[PDB]
Design a protein around this ligand. Structure first.
Ligand code: HEM
Ligand code: B9U
Length: 392
């Protein structure tokens, strides 16, 4: 079977093999960097099936040497569970991670974007939209929400890569950093149990201790993935989105003159940005399933190449084109079905506030270097810039 990934992900370029696979062989057998061989799934319709059809399981992966790009299986907490365990954690989170809580964060989120832009301006151009905006914006928001002290970022931020690194960390470094993060969250939970604050960890501990009993370890592992999602996924998506906007200056001009397009713009960025470097987490078939002419037998794994589903020309017209006016946008950038992104309302809020504020306050914002000089973060499960120098 083809060794997969076929090629290292470069900048935001999509490997042209996905288009060929989608056209000529949408499901193909591959060998993975780690774990068992798998079926690479490339089309939008098959993506929905393996993500939402109950014939495909995440919890089954623990009964295998899970097909994966990471040296060790990731502690994916809720995202590694099936019903009923999944239902138990999803209910817990939905009860404390309410829409009211999110919209109550809006003024704090807006204020953080304005404060970050005040700093960029006071420091003068060129500024770095990654370490000077996307990272601390995403970080302060998730830290505010979760109850992780943003002041501890110096400690915990260097452990987060352990949850995402493919080629650039050893088993031993991943295991050590995973233990460091879990143990840091566990100490936080002791404080938050005794001294609850208005944050998710306190609410989760209270709800778990009182009704929806979770083990300490389950609580730790769930708070940990919430930290990763808010800190890393959000800042990665945001900085990649700014890159897309800078490299499509015509759409950036359109957005600035019709701000009511921002909701559809965020959705189009979710679709178009190939944020996931290759695939999200493998599922395993519990029964035989045919996908685009390929029989996937029970016990075999499928790799969901979500970014390729989001370039499916049979679902999105001119799927290879970034078009922030796109109206039909059933993208899978926030997943689909049972494991669809619980944080999507918040991520959409953050995206909209960040882009609106930047475009509002920095009218002539533009990249300070040619796209060729940019340094990307390689060897992770998502794509991101290390620096995005800008003028204004
Ligand atoms: C732009 C930012 C984000 C993107 C692109 C994103 C994307 C995704 C995707 C694609 C999935 C499904 C993965 C799969 O099926 O293998 C997912 C699941 C999930 N995401 Fe998000 N996410 C983002 C931000 C967030 C935030 C801010 C949170 C929480 C504060 C969050 C929490 C979760 C959780 C808990 C799950 C698993 C839910 C379950 O298994 O039931 N994400 N996310
Ligand atoms: C979830 C997809 C966008 C993709 O698999 C990804 O970024 N995984 C990272 C790195 O392994 C881990 C992660 C990010 N949010 C999560 C939410 C729940 C569990 C794990 C994660």
């Amino acid at each position: 079977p083809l060794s997969y990934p076929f090629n290292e992900a470069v900048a935001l370029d999509v490997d042209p093999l996905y288009a060929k696979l989608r056209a000529e062989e949408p499901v193909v057998r591959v060998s993975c960097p780690f774990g068992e061989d798998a079926w690479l799934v490339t089309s939008h319709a098959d993506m929905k099936t393996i993500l939402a059809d109950p014939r495909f399981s995440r919890a089954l992966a623990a009964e295998h040497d899970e097909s994966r790009l990471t040296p060790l299986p990731i502690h994916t907490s809720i995202l590694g569970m099936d019903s009923p365990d999944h239902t138990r954690l999803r209910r817990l989170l939905a009860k404390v991670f309410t829409m009211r809580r999110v919209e109550l964060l809006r003024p704090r989120i807006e204020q953080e974007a304005d404060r970050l832009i005040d700093a960029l301006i006071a420091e003068g151009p060129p500024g770095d939209l990654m370490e000077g905006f996307a990272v601390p914006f995403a970080g302060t928001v998730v830290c505010d929400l979760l109850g992780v002290p943003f002041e501890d970022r110096e400690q915990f931020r260097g452990w987060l890569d352990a949850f995402s690194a493919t080629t650039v960390m050893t088993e031993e470094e991943i295991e050590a950093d995973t233990e460091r993060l879990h143990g840091y969250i566990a100490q936080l939970m002791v404080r938050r149990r005794a001294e609850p604050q208005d944050d998710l960890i306190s609410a989760m501990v209270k709800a778990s201790d009182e009704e929806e009993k979770l083990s300490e370890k389950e609580l730790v592992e769930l708070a940990s993935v919430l930290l990763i999602a808010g800190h890393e996924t959000v800042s990665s998506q945001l900085i990649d989105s700014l890159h897309v906007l800078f490299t499509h200056p015509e759409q950036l001009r359109l957005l600035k003159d019709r701000p009511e397009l921002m909701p559809g713009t965020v959705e189009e960025l979710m679709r178009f940005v190939p944020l996931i470097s290759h695939v999200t987490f493998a599922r395993y078939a519990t029964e035989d399933v045919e996908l685009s002419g390929t029989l996937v037998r029970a016990g075999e794994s499928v790799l969901p190449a979500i970014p390729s589903a989001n370039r499916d020309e049979s679902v999105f017209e001119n799927a290879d084109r970034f078009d922030l006016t796109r109206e039909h946008n059933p993208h899978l950038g926030f997943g689909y079905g049972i494991h669809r992104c619980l944080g999507a309302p918040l991520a959409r809020l953050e995206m909209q506030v960040a882009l609106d504020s930047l475009l509002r306050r920095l009218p002539e914002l533009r990249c300070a270097v040619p796209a060729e000089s940019l340094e990307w973060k390689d060897g992770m499960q998502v794509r991101s810039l290390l620096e995005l120098p800008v003028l204004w």
